[PDB]
Amino acid sequence: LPALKLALEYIVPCMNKHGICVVDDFLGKETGQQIGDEVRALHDTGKFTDGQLVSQKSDSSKDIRGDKITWIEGKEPGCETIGLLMSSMDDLIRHCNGKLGSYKIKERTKAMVACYPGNGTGYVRHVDNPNGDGRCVTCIYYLNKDWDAKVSGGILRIFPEGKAQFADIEPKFDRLLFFWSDRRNPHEVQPAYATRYAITVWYFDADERARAKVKYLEKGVRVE
Ligand SMILES: O=C(O)CNC(=O)c1nc(Cl)c2ccccc2c1O
Ligand SMILES: [Mn+2]
């Protein structure tokens, strides 16, 4: 589907109504599987971190580690299809310009590729941007073939503010997710019992990001 039909007929109205929007079959099986292959090669050649320290045991051989990450620009060798994914995310956001809230999105982060190793670890409940750092939209792409949450867990559970219910999103192959990054969407990753990959990009609102630079004042200018 053109980034445009999807953006204008589904993503824009969904984000303004619900703030949480799922697109399945974003890139297709061939491109999705190539991204999966690039991510697995990154993992298998040791490009990820060792994982979030979960239990700091007295003996370190007993330390439990969780989600592993790596930051990907998209131009690295063997990340070209990841870069294609990122360009496709950018195309979608660009076709939403001036329709996502009142936000104006001119910049994003690099991609954070995450691997939950499948050892029962998840990710605690949190808000992506609780303190106004500029991030207004969180975009996650999943690449887990035939994921069965009843068996492997790993559901993303979101707790939409003001609503007495949560929204459970399975980390399905070739699924793209958008949600507001601020306190509207506290969320958690339930324990994952199989290897679980995701690629996240955050989009900045230009105003919020510009004034965030005041708080984090960071390179300066010489006086004398
Ligand atoms: O993977 C998912 O479905 C959702 N993941 C996250 O919400 C998530 N959020 C943050 Cl802020 C981090 C931050 C660092 C590493 C992994 C993260 C993560 O998986
Ligand atoms: Mn998060």
Author numbering: 188 to 404, 407 to 413
Q: What are the paper's exact sentences on this?
A:
The ferrous iron and 2-oxoglutarate (2OG)-dependent HIF prolyl hydroxylases (PHDs/EGLNs) catalyse trans-4-prolyl hydroxylations on HIFα subunits, thus promoting their binding to the von Hippel–Lindau protein (VHL), a targeting component of a ubiquitin E3 ligase, and signalling for HIFα degradation under normoxic conditions. The PHD-catalysed hydroxylations of HIF-1α/HIF-2α in higher animals occur in amino- and carboxy-terminal oxygen-dependent degradation domains (NODD and CODD). The three human PHDs exhibit different NODD/CODD selectivities, with PHD3 being substantially more selective for CODD than PHD1/2 (refs 16). Biophysical analyses employing crystallography and NMR reveal that the molecular basis of PHD isoform and variant selectivity involves enzyme–substrate interactions involving β2/β3 loop residues (that bind the LXXLAP motif) and helices α3 and α4, regions which display sequence variations between the PHD isoforms.
Using biochemical and structural studies, we identified four more residues in α3 and α3-βI loop regions (PHD2/Ile280, Arg281, Ile292 and Gly294 that are substituted in PHD3/Val102, Leu103, Val114 and Glu116, respectively) and which play roles in determining selectivity. Indeed, we found that FG2216 (IOX3)35, used in clinical trials for treatment of anaemia, preferentially displaces NODD over CODD from PHD2.
